[PDB]
Amino acid sequence: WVIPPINLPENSRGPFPQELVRIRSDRDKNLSLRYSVTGPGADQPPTGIFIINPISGQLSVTKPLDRELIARFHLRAHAVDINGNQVENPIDIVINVIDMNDNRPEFLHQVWNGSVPEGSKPGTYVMTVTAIDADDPNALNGMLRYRIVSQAPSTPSPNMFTINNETGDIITVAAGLDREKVQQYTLIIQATDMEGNPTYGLSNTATAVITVTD
Numbered sequence: 001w002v003i004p005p006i007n008l009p010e011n012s013r014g015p016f017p018q019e020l021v022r023i024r025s026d027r028d029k030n031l032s033l034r035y036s037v038t039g040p041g042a043d044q045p046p047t048g049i050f051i052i053n054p055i056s057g058q059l060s061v062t063k064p065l066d067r068e069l070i071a072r073f074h075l076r077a078h079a080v081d082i083n084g085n086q087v088e089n090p091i092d093i094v095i096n097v098i099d100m101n102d103n104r105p106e107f108l109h110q111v112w113n114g115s116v117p118e119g120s121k122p123g124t125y126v127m128t129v130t131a132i133d134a135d136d137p138n139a140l141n142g143m144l145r146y147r148i149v150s151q152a153p154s155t156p157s158p159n160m161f162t163i164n165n166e167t168g169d170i171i172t173v174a175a176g177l178d179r180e181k182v183q184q185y186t187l188i189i190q191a192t193d194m195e196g197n198p199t200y201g202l203s204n205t206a207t208a209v210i211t212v213t214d
């Protein structure tokens with residue numbers, strides 16, 4: 001066998017120590033054994049998180065894990081005798097730090113600039129804003145989707161532009177961009193994670209100051 005990569009959530013609350021798996025050998029059913037665990041998260045930075053029980057072999061976490069820092073741990077528990085000789089070859093222990101949505105979708109610029117050619121056909125791409133998620137790019141924890149919360153001004157009338165829910169590329173979908181009637185628009189663009197869930201997913205805003213060229 002080996003040890004089926006134990007998946008352990010991010011930011012947990014133990015109370016650490018939190019036992020995971022009691023790494024037992026067969027030699028311990030012969031010679032009395034001494035266990036140790038080496039790999040980052042163990043001995044190597046972060047110095048002290050996963051620790052085995054030298055006596056009982058019970059692997060254990062000592063503080064909550066957090067992916068933005070390390071998302072996965074590869075460890076090796078060692079078996080030694082009274083002479084320092086390894087009695088068994090160091091077992092691999094893959095500790096997957098299962099993710100938890102723990103941060104909003106962040107934009108790359110609190111303000112964004114752009115412009116469209118005044119009288120321009122619908123479909124045109126003004127600018128492209130983006131916001132991402134520090135997540136596990138695969139989970140609706142980091143999947144974003146955008147949408148325009150507001151438009152200023154609103155004349156001729158609003159609903160003039162539109163962001164592609166997934167990409168970012170804003171597009172003018174309403175004729176009449178009059179550099180005279182309104183020479184500068186200030187769009188408020190929002191991005192939410194969890195593919196959009198209005199409560200589950202968290203969100204952010206930014207501004208798309210779209211300008212009307214000659």
Ligand SMILES: [Ca+2]
Pocket residue numbers: 010011065066067068102
């Ligand atoms: Ca985290």
Ligand SMILES: [Ca+2]
Pocket residue numbers: 010067099100101102103135
């Ligand atoms: Ca997370």
Ligand SMILES: [Ca+2]
Pocket residue numbers: 101102103104105133134135141142193194202
């Ligand atoms: Ca997120």
